[PDB]
Write an enzyme that holds these catalytic residues in place. Structure first.
Site, PDB file in Angstrom:
ATOM      1  N   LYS B  86       0.570  -1.085  -0.561  1.00  0.00           N
ATOM      2  CA  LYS B  86      -0.357   0.205  -0.188  1.00  0.00           C
ATOM      3  C   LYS B  86       0.841   1.099   0.260  1.00  0.00           C
ATOM      4  O   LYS B  86       0.882   2.461  -0.322  1.00  0.00           O
ATOM      5  CB  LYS B  86      -1.048  -0.108   1.643  1.00  0.00           C
ATOM      6  CG  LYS B  86      -2.612  -1.173   1.264  1.00  0.00           C
ATOM      7  CD  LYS B  86      -2.989  -1.070  -0.116  1.00  0.00           C
ATOM      8  CE  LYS B  86      -4.211  -1.992   0.380  1.00  0.00           C
ATOM      9  NZ  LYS B  86      -5.625  -1.568  -0.175  1.00  0.00           N
ATOM     10  N   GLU B 108      -9.454   5.439   3.559  1.00  0.00           N
ATOM     11  CA  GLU B 108     -10.351   4.272   4.172  1.00  0.00           C
ATOM     12  C   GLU B 108      -9.405   3.947   4.480  1.00  0.00           C
ATOM     13  O   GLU B 108      -8.055   3.584   4.111  1.00  0.00           O
ATOM     14  CB  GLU B 108     -11.379   4.287   3.049  1.00  0.00           C
ATOM     15  CG  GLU B 108     -10.210   3.564   1.791  1.00  0.00           C
ATOM     16  CD  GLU B 108     -10.246   3.339   0.949  1.00  0.00           C
ATOM     17  OE1 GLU B 108      -9.340   5.014   1.161  1.00  0.00           O
ATOM     18  OE2 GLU B 108      -9.139   2.736   0.457  1.00  0.00           O
ATOM     19  N   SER B 376       2.167  -9.399  -0.189  1.00  0.00           N
ATOM     20  CA  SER B 376       1.640  -8.572  -0.334  1.00  0.00           C
ATOM     21  C   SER B 376       1.176  -7.604   0.864  1.00  0.00           C
ATOM     22  O   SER B 376       2.392  -6.013   1.585  1.00  0.00           O
ATOM     23  CB  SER B 376       0.324  -7.954  -0.555  1.00  0.00           C
ATOM     24  OG  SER B 376      -0.994  -8.767   0.166  1.00  0.00           O
TER      25      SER B 376
HETATM   26  C1  LIG Z   1      -7.614  -2.865   3.474  1.00  0.00           C
HETATM   27  C2  LIG Z   1      -6.731  -2.895   3.415  1.00  0.00           C
HETATM   28  N1  LIG Z   1      -5.472  -3.274   3.249  1.00  0.00           N
HETATM   29  C3  LIG Z   1      -5.977  -4.633   1.860  1.00  0.00           C
HETATM   30  C4  LIG Z   1      -4.468  -5.687   1.599  1.00  0.00           C
HETATM   31  C5  LIG Z   1      -4.940  -6.698   0.272  1.00  0.00           C
HETATM   32  C6  LIG Z   1      -5.599  -5.828  -0.863  1.00  0.00           C
HETATM   33  O1  LIG Z   1      -6.237  -5.248  -1.046  1.00  0.00           O
HETATM   34  P1  LIG Z   1      -5.948  -5.021  -2.791  1.00  0.00           P
HETATM   35  O2  LIG Z   1      -6.055  -6.221  -3.193  1.00  0.00           O
HETATM   36  O3  LIG Z   1      -5.815  -3.346  -2.592  1.00  0.00           O
HETATM   37  O4  LIG Z   1      -4.253  -5.079  -2.469  1.00  0.00           O
HETATM   38  C7  LIG Z   1      -3.474  -6.754   0.041  1.00  0.00           C
HETATM   39  N2  LIG Z   1      -2.490  -7.286   0.903  1.00  0.00           N
HETATM   40  C8  LIG Z   1      -2.409  -6.441   1.978  1.00  0.00           C
HETATM   41  C9  LIG Z   1      -0.984  -6.651   2.907  1.00  0.00           C
HETATM   42  C10 LIG Z   1      -3.797  -5.894   2.505  1.00  0.00           C
HETATM   43  O5  LIG Z   1      -3.240  -4.714   3.414  1.00  0.00           O
HETATM   44  C11 LIG Z   1      -6.075  -1.319   3.823  1.00  0.00           C
HETATM   45  O6  LIG Z   1      -5.260  -1.593   4.200  1.00  0.00           O
HETATM   46  O7  LIG Z   1      -6.846  -0.427   4.321  1.00  0.00           O
END
Ligand SMILES: C=C(/N=C/c1c(COP(=O)(O)O)cnc(C)c1O)C(=O)O
Ligand SMILES: O=P(O)(O)OCCNS(=O)(=O)c1ccc(OC(F)(F)F)cc1
Ligand SMILES: O=P(O)(O)OCCNS(=O)(=O)c1ccc(OC(F)(F)F)cc1
Ligand SMILES: C=C(/N=C/c1c(COP(=O)(O)O)cnc(C)c1O)C(=O)O
Ligand code: NA
Ligand code: NA
EC number: 4.2.1.20
Lengths: 268, 395, 395, 268
Positions: B86, B108, B376
């Site tokens: 992120k 958010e 991630s």
């Molecule tokens: C909802 C959140 N994060 C999602 C997230 C995700 C899923 O979000 P994306 O599909 O936008 O990558 C994947 N991996 C990690 C480490 C994450 O923190 C947030 O941090 O707000």
């Protein structure tokens, strides 16, 4: 039909602005909602703006969020709302009825079918809150095909291109947004900006109703004085419902008092 | 009128109240300008390298593929400053916010990794940051709440709806619709109205660019597939983008299966919802028969979302990418396996991607395959949740 | 008889029960061999790069030096896999353990960062890991306990003595004296009996080597000073080593001042103890008039130790390095400042080094100085401690 | 003096091994400790090994750790231990007295001064547990200068170089470690390894006492049979103290019984 056109001509002749309450259909239940709406009309509402409960109303502040939640707690569905609308029109043949919709409820099982249902029950206009003019083509086409006025928004940040599109694409009335933000009585908007009212008139737009944060007779008068054709009040009305849930009689009395006072202020 | 295409096939668009269209148009123009500005690109590159720690490692698994014909690499976004991918696009959006003369940030967050990223970038770049987070997520991702607050961000719990990510998204957008004159909405995923899906992809695409360079260096060929979890879609599109035109490379996105698709308690709308309009976009979503938005569910807060970014819906529709689901229990097993056999504690979100790779290997153990999982984030935020479950489980 | 010098001037040696001398001699021989083995060096380098994420960034502070003539860089060991510099030398010692045919690891930990490092390396390299941790530290560094356990390490709380790092060290050594045939003692700091102070320095020296290369690249000259916190001495010697022969470069080590040196509740024996023999070494220690070892104190578990590595005692004695102290309150202010102004959450240990750099700047704001602080770890482990204090403080 | 030399010659003549209890000085208090020590001697102890309480005893398991803690709880200091040693020697002119020390207590205010104090009170030997032969030079020099025997350790992992150094540098007795690890009665060591006993004899080392994990008469007999000059028991003795803290009379009775049985086993 020509319900908005007829109303505005009548108001024009009487040198009056329109006063237009908003409520959520089925708040706090179907039967009480129908009584509320009858009270609004008897008390002098010139037109109605009626919300179909939606799970995620992103243009609404807490007051109307909570109205949606009350309706859901009573099990209110779009299907039941359409039953209500038919009953309202049966009682009241000439009052313009506008719906406040969110896009997903219109799109859900076909845009065309949605507007066809609106026509069947005798709705006059639909305002889709989260569809800007840029995305409006299938909505306005379906609206016009089914004799429904598509309502568009003139925000305070409107440029000339938007003014021209709103004037061209919209029917019934033009929504003149008081302010940025979401619905709510605590957040008082500005006076109708005369520059926008007079540009809309130049471009032969549908008559302007000012909305968002209108909660007092003074504000309705001020909208009329500024050249708007009328004013919408939602949260102020909904607060009276919220305050009087355990006192349905007092609820109707206070609604009548408030609507009558707001309507009185529209008379010039 | 826009400078760039707001749609990916039928999906995407700009379904916001009219009030917000100037803000979206302004953001698009600022992005287009920035993308061709060498000074902006240099500033962004400098932050990514010297502040965030890019490039991130590509780690070959030494143990978990033993006795199979799978070679598995992990792209280590868990090593990025803040602990998740992120951070990458937040740095770019924060620079855009400054390009545009904005002094405040709204964000958010679900997992709190985007919230931590927004807070850290705001602290660095001199912006005033407020973060909406569902009340359920405030509890289950509590370490990130502490981190955001220590960095001077305001964290606002959201009790409405499911009290999870979609509810945080709702409140952020409501706020922005009133505050856009001074606040930039730093949307944290590849979803929402144009231009966010595009901007987020472009500011995450270094994940796949680096992966390509690293895998070529180490293996002399492209991966057979790259695998990433999919909430809103940012880490996955960031991994996928540079490979889209490499037709041999599989792109596999992993949605949360929650308690199981059949239970309805999941977050897999791409494959198990239907198209709707919500959160500013036309996209697959979990919805009732009547078109109310359904509440999602996942053990992982970051994947607990009832929609998906429009570019993923498009890539699926044309068959360029394939999307699957992984249940809570499958994700938990992958979490434990990586901890105990590779000494890496992954985010529960990332654990969904790893779980699918483990299934690809275990189901066909003599299939030769070179796989990359986008790891991630790190799982520090999840350790108390996972402990409490493994304890109640009797482990 | 040894291959290398066990002493740094008067300090150091091999003050262990006779039973353990063969084990120390074996370890020394294995280290000397490994150091000249290209295969070992390649394996170690590969792990550092592709698993741990070296090199770590060198970040120029953009905000905290405003209006002064100080330029401050932070060496980002907080970005290393595991969250602290401790990971570097654990990877090297784990490879040594395998060089020597050992199947089990014993480690002590205070902050739990060495414990996390030992656990992750053991998981990766197929060793059975048990970690001693003082019971007080189990509480105040609880996130690391959770991390160690999830990675399959046995964590053994130590209730004896102060229930802090020295007590963990005691129990680890007691264990090793019975288990050395099969267990390697992976000592986690630059202290203890020879050859540990030497091995730990050599397996941490990439910190200063990278720093030198990075600062030259970015500034075209060496730092005026490099500043590091000092518990046992590993992160500081790792930063210092490559600069020892660069006589212009100040080497500043920061011991914990606790509640204040005058209170006796501190961990600053180098400057406020006297030479003694304990934990296998002749070194400054906090001791009673009669020669009982005193219990130390610091807000930071990683610095809560009543002795110091012998090479630091030596560098101090000859005036090559200077040692200072920083109190709990000074460290807390530095922690808050970095969080809010640079968007980096530092370990409370590292915060002591930063606090001293902030004093160097604030006391003489028109002095031109190029400083590097070794940011030895991230502060995730500390966020609950710091919250509870700032809350009870009325902030 | 020649107290160990005299003892071993006497035991040799009687075809006996030595039985040597260990206790911590001042456990559980000064007065009770002195009574315990008198009991040990009356019950047949041939020599004593006496610990000075130390904060961090790294060669000791929990039993003797707790003995140190009890002495500290009674406020016992090295100075008080030296007062005790003087009183013990005053009562018992010929029994060999050895101290178990940790390095810091010896080093603290001068190695030379430490050994000088030992001589003044009539101590015969000092075993510094955490000083291997490699680090022993200033300790053994000070010991010999003050007529104190420095005791060195022959572990089971002893090589030839260590055997030769221990034989050369040590006086009084050679400590033959039963096993690796730390002190403790639960962890039973092996039989004295005959290879080490016979190498020590070849190199003219001081007579060997086997120590660590000796808790039963059988083990004392076995040490004698294996060619050791005697056996040390610590934790087994200390456990009797620990068990009987509230019963000082029973404590002494049980100590007497145990020591007498252990001594009986040393007779060949
Ligand atoms: C909802 C959140 N994060 C999602 C997230 C995700 C899923 O979000 P994306 O599909 O936008 O990558 C994947 N991996 C990690 C480490 C994450 O923190 C947030 O941090 O707000
Ligand atoms: O009096 P308030 O402040 O509650 O305002 C009531 C407004 N009710 S409404 O149906 O006109 C209405 C009109 C437009 C809305 O959003 C949009 F502008 F984006 F389209 C939302 C509600
Ligand atoms: O019967 P146990 O198992 O309690 O053993 C009692 C031993 N007491 S002692 O003073 O001889 C003794 C002798 C040597 C020690 O450590 C060293 F070998 F490293 F030097 C420690 C204690
Ligand atoms: C006591 C521990 N760590 C100490 C530590 C220290 C102090 O130890 P050294 O003096 O060995 O660097 C510094 N910085 C960080 C992040 C640390 O975790 C431990 O993790 O076991
Ligand atoms: Na999804
Ligand atoms: Na220290």
């Amino acid at each position: 039909m020509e319900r908005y056109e007829n109303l505005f001509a009548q108001l024009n002749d009487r040198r009056e602005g329109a006063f237009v309450p908003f409520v959520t259909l089925g708040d706090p239940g179907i039967e009480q909602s129908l009584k509320i709406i009858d009270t609004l009309i008897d008390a002098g509402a010139d037109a109605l703006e009626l919300g179909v409960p939606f799970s995620d109303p992103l243009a609404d502040g807490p007051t109307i969020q909570n109205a949606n939640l009350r309706a859901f707690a009573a099990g209110v569905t779009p299907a039941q709302c359409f039953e209500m609308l038919a009953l309202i029109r049966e009682k009241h043949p000439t009052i313009p009825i506008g719906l406040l919709m969110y896009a997903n409820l219109v799109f859900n099982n076909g845009i065309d079918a949605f507007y066809a249902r609106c026509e069947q029950v005798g709705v006059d206009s639909v305002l889709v809150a989260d569809v800007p003019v840029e995305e409006s083509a299938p909505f306005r086409q379906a609206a016009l095909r089914h004799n429904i006025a598509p309502i568009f928004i003139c925000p305070p940040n409107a440029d000339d291109d938007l003014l021209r599109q709103v004037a061209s694409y919209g029917r019934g009335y033009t929504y003149l947004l008081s302010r940025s933000g979401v619905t709510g009585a605590e957040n008082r908007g500005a006076l109708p900006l005369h520059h926008l009212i007079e540009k809309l008139k130049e471009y032969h737009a549908a008559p302007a109703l000012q909305g968002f944060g209108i909660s007092s007779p003074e504000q309705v008068s001020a909208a009329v004085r500024a050249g708007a054709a009328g004013a919408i009040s939602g949260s102020a009305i909904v607060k009276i419902i919220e305050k009087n849930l355990a006192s349905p009689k007092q609820m109707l009395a206070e609604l009548r008092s408030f609507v009558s006072a707001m309507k009185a202020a529209s008379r010039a | 009128t826009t400078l760039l295409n707001p749609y990916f096939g039928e999906f995407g668009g700009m379904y916001v109240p009219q009030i917000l269209m100037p803000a979206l148009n302004q953001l698009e123009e600022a992005f287009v300008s920035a993308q061709k500005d060498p000074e902006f690109q240099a500033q962004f590159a400098d932050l990514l390298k010297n502040y965030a720690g890019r490039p991130t490692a590509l780690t070959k698994c030494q143990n978990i593929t033993a006795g199979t014909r799978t070679t598995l690499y992990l792209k280590r976004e868990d090593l990025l400053h803040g602990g998740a991918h992120k951070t990458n696009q937040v740095l770019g959006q924060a620079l855009l916010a400054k390009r545009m003369g904005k002094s405040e940030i709204i964000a958010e967050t679900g997992a709190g990794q985007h919230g931590v990223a927004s807070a850290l970038a705001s602290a660095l770049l001199g912006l005033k940051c407020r973060i909406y987070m569902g009340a359920k997520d405030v509890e289950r991702q509590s370490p990130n709440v502490f981190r955001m607050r220590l960095m001077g961000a305001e964290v606002i719990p959201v009790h409405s709806g499911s009290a999870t990510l979609k509810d945080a998204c709702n409140e952020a957008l409501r706020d922005w619709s009133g505050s856009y004159e001074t606040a930039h909405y730093m949307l944290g995923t590849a979803a929402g109205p144009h231009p966010y899906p595009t901007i987020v992809r472009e500011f995450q695409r270094m994940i796949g660019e680096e992966t390509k360079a690293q895998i070529l260096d180490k293996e002399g060929r492209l991966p057979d597939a790259v695998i990433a979890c999919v909430g809103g879609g940012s880490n996955a599109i960031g991994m996928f983008a540079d490979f889209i035109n490499d037709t041999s490379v599989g792109l596999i996105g992993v949605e949360p299966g929650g308690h199981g698709i059949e239970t309805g308690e999941h977050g897999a709308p791409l494959k198990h919802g239907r198209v709707g309009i919500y959160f500013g976009m036309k996209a697959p979503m979990m919805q009732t028969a009547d078109g109310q938005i359904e509440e999602s569910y996942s053990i992982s807060a970051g994947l607990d979302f009832p929609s998906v970014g429009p570019q993923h819906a498009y890539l699926n529709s044309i068959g360029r990418a394939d999307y699957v689901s992984i249940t809570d229990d499958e994700a938990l097993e992958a979490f434990k396996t990586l901890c105990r056999h590779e000494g890496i504690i992954p985010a529960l979100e990332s654990s969904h991607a790893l779980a699918h790779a483990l299934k690809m290997m275990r189901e066909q153990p003599e299939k030769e395959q070179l796989l990359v999982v986008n790891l991630s984030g790190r799982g520090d935020k999840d350790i108390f949740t996972v402990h409490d479950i493994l304890k109640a489980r009797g482990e």
